[PDB]
Amino acid sequence: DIVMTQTPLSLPVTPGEPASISCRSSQSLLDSEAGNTYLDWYLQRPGQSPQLLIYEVSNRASGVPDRFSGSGSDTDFTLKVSRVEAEDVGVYYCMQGIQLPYSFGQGTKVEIK
Amino acid sequence: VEQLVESGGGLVQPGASLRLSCAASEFTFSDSDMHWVRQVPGQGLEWVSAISLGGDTHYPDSVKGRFTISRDNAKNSLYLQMNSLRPEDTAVYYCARGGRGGYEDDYGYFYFIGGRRSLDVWGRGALVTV
Amino acid sequence: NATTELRNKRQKVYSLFYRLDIVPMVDLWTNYRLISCNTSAITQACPKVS
Amino acid sequence: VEQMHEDIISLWDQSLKPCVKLTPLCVGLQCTNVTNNITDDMRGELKNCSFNATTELRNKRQKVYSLFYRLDIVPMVDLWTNYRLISCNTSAITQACPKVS
Amino acid sequence: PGQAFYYTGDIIGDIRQAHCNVSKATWNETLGKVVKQLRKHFGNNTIIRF
Ligand SMILES: *[C@@H]1O[C@H](CO)[C@@H](O)[C@H](O)[C@H]1NC(C)=O
Ligand SMILES: *[C@@H]1O[C@H](CO)[C@@H](O)[C@H](O)[C@H]1NC(C)=O
Ligand SMILES: *[C@@H]1O[C@H](CO)[C@@H](O)[C@H](O)[C@H]1NC(C)=O
Ligand SMILES: *[C@@H]1O[C@H](CO)[C@@H](O)[C@H](O)[C@H]1NC(C)=O
Ligand SMILES: *[C@@H]1O[C@H](CO)[C@@H](O)[C@H](O)[C@H]1NC(C)=O
Ligand SMILES: *[C@@H]1O[C@H](CO)[C@@H](O)[C@H](O)[C@H]1NC(C)=O
Ligand SMILES: *[C@@H]1O[C@H](CO)[C@@H](O)[C@H](O)[C@H]1NC(C)=O
């Protein structure tokens, strides 16, 4: 199977400073023939809990503002946000998309600092 | 928007069976893969099952032999038949859409190279308590 | 929508065709087709043959 | 020697030409482990592969289970299928005509 | 399986019409020579136009 390990388990962020949330896949996620690497970021809110945030590398889902654009490679990948807004505070999840188990990592809970 | 609504659930005893379903919304249940995902009240997201365009299914090791999923397509709904539930299985269950294809008789149900594989079209979720 | 190595899968292909190589066609999702598919088989010339 | 080489290749090509082209086999194979009793040195050398093969009617397809050797198939990273035939990225695979020695 | 299709991917630089350059004076003299030889068959006082 593929083990997705989330590096932070808790990350209080001041709304006036940037933040970085990262995780690593135990297996390479690169589809060599297609050239696409399958990774997804999700953001959980107290209201609508499930929601797609980031698809693959630097491809925002519909409705997601530019501030959520991420980066990374085929194992270790990260989201970097210049400012955390009140609506952006929630639990972030990593998912791999190359095998049917679709393993998820641990969530990162954002707090008000 | 493209968003499905879960229906079904309730409080059951160990050993009971349930038929949980998701309705089609805005053609998201036609040429598309479907997934069932578990939200544990106190833990992270856990994938439960997935069904392909052609009716192939996949479950993790903790689920095989207990849960069954299917699609009828004529009635535009996804079904999950739950069996042999345990107290550890109390959670919110919901559907998601996978990738998309098409249906031409050159070869039934086809996927795209580099196509979508993310989980999208999230519903609200049903609470299942044992 | 082009076919590929495996009958199971397909692929979305983008290309630049000359207006003289295409003919208007009416469909819901398409606008043009290749000029010779209406009347005859098209064989691609081998790139290794000068 | 050069003439014998060209003659054997030419006769080989003539024998295989009027045979089944196996175009329907370049699909995606759902391969699992063979469930029989496998000796220590045969583990992973034979796979039980399920595919949807065509039939006489163009619109009807049948699910076919067959055992392929590991050397005949190559892994891929599709979600629903695991392997494909090794030669489908290179050339068409012609079946040798049956009842030919 | 083994069927490779080649197509135009993109165009780098401006898109311009293909063209041929033929020298004007050389072509004009060539037409003058053709006109003289045609007059040898159609008459010295016949107006020849292209
Ligand atoms: C294979 O063919 C069977 C015929 O009944 C069909 O039900 C099934 O969906 C097909 N499978 C795939 C993966 O296309
Ligand atoms: C296609 O070929 C037929 C052959 O007669 C011809 O009548 C028809 O006009 C052609 N289609 C177009 C769009 O020119
Ligand atoms: C291959 O899998 C099918 C699944 O139904 C099974 O019936 C068949 O016996 C398997 N083949 C072997 C050699 O185990
Ligand atoms: C199939 O056999 C291979 C041989 O090495 C083994 O690694 C793999 O785990 C086996 N799969 C199952 C599902 O038992
Ligand atoms: C076919 O795929 C295999 C995968 O290992 C690769 O080694 C081989 O070069 C490929 N052939 C072609 C012609 O692309
Ligand atoms: C064609 O190219 C040659 C290359 O040297 C040049 O000398 C010649 O003048 C060109 N002719 C025209 C008509 O452009
Ligand atoms: C045209 O004139 C030239 C000389 O002026 C003469 O040699 C030639 O024969 C004439 N041709 C005709 C068709 O009259």
UniProtKB/TrEMBL annotation, chain D:
It is found in: Host cell membrane; Host endosome membrane; Virion membrane. Disulfide bonds join C19-C97, C26-C88, C31-C49. Highly glycosylated by host. The high number of glycan on the protein is reffered to as 'glycan shield' because it contributes to hide protein sequence from adaptive immune system. It comes from the Viruses. Glycans are attached at Q30, N33, N37, N48, N52, N89. HIV-1 lineages are divided in three main groups, M (for Major), O (for Outlier), and N (for New, or Non-M, Non-O). The vast majority of strains found worldwide belong to the group M. Group O seems to be endemic to and largely confined to Cameroon and neighboring countries in West Central Africa, where these viruses represent a small minority of HIV-1 strains. The group N is represented by a limited number of isolates from Cameroonian persons. The group M is further subdivided in 9 clades or subtypes (A to D, F to H, J and K). Envelope glycoprotein gp160: Oligomerizes in the host endoplasmic reticulum into predominantly trimers. In a second time, gp160 transits in the host Golgi, where glycosylation is completed. The precursor is then proteolytically cleaved in the trans-Golgi and thereby activated by cellular furin or furin-like proteases to produce gp120 and gp41. Transmembrane protein gp41: Acts as a class I viral fusion protein. Under the current model, the protein has at least 3 conformational states: pre-fusion native state, pre-hairpin intermediate state, and post-fusion hairpin state. During fusion of viral and target intracellular membranes, the coiled coil regions (heptad repeats) assume a trimer-of-hairpins structure, positioning the fusion peptide in close proximity to the C-terminal region of the ectodomain. The formation of this structure appears to drive apposition and subsequent fusion of viral and target cell membranes. The CD4-binding region is targeted by the antibody b12. Belongs to the HIV-1 env protein family. The mature envelope protein (Env) consists of a homotrimer of non-covalently associated gp120-gp41 heterodimers. The resulting complex protrudes from the virus surface as a spike. There seems to be as few as 10 spikes on the average virion. Surface protein gp120 interacts with host CD4, CCR5 and CXCR4. Gp120 also interacts with the C-type lectins CD209/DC-SIGN and CLEC4M/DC-SIGNR (collectively referred to as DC-SIGN(R)). Gp120 and gp41 interact with GalCer. This is Envelope glycoprotein gp160. The chain holds residues 100 to 208 of 860 of the full protein.
From TrEMBL, chain E:
It is found in: Host cell membrane; Host endosome membrane; Virion membrane. Signal peptide: none annotated. Belongs to the HIV-1 env protein family. Highly glycosylated by host. The high number of glycan on the protein is reffered to as 'glycan shield' because it contributes to hide protein sequence from adaptive immune system. Palmitoylation of the transmembrane protein and of Env polyprotein (prior to its proteolytic cleavage) is essential for their association with host cell membrane lipid rafts. Palmitoylation is therefore required for envelope trafficking to classical lipid rafts, but not for viral replication. This is Envelope glycoprotein gp160. The CD4-binding region is targeted by the antibody b12. The chain holds residues 310 to 359 of 860 of the full protein. It comes from Human immunodeficiency virus type 1 (HIV-1). Envelope glycoprotein gp160: Oligomerizes in the host endoplasmic reticulum into predominantly trimers. In a second time, gp160 transits in the host Golgi, where glycosylation is completed. The precursor is then proteolytically cleaved in the trans-Golgi and thereby activated by cellular furin or furin-like proteases to produce gp120 and gp41. Transmembrane protein gp41: Acts as a class I viral fusion protein. Under the current model, the protein has at least 3 conformational states: pre-fusion native state, pre-hairpin intermediate state, and post-fusion hairpin state. During fusion of viral and target intracellular membranes, the coiled coil regions (heptad repeats) assume a trimer-of-hairpins structure, positioning the fusion peptide in close proximity to the C-terminal region of the ectodomain. The formation of this structure appears to drive apposition and subsequent fusion of viral and target cell membranes. It comes from the Viruses. The mature envelope protein (Env) consists of a homotrimer of non-covalently associated gp120-gp41 heterodimers. The resulting complex protrudes from the virus surface as a spike. There seems to be as few as 10 spikes on the average virion. Surface protein gp120 interacts with host CD4, CCR5 and CXCR4. Gp120 also interacts with the C-type lectins CD209/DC-SIGN and CLEC4M/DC-SIGNR (collectively referred to as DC-SIGN(R)). Gp120 and gp41 interact with GalCer. Glycans are attached at N28, N44, N45.
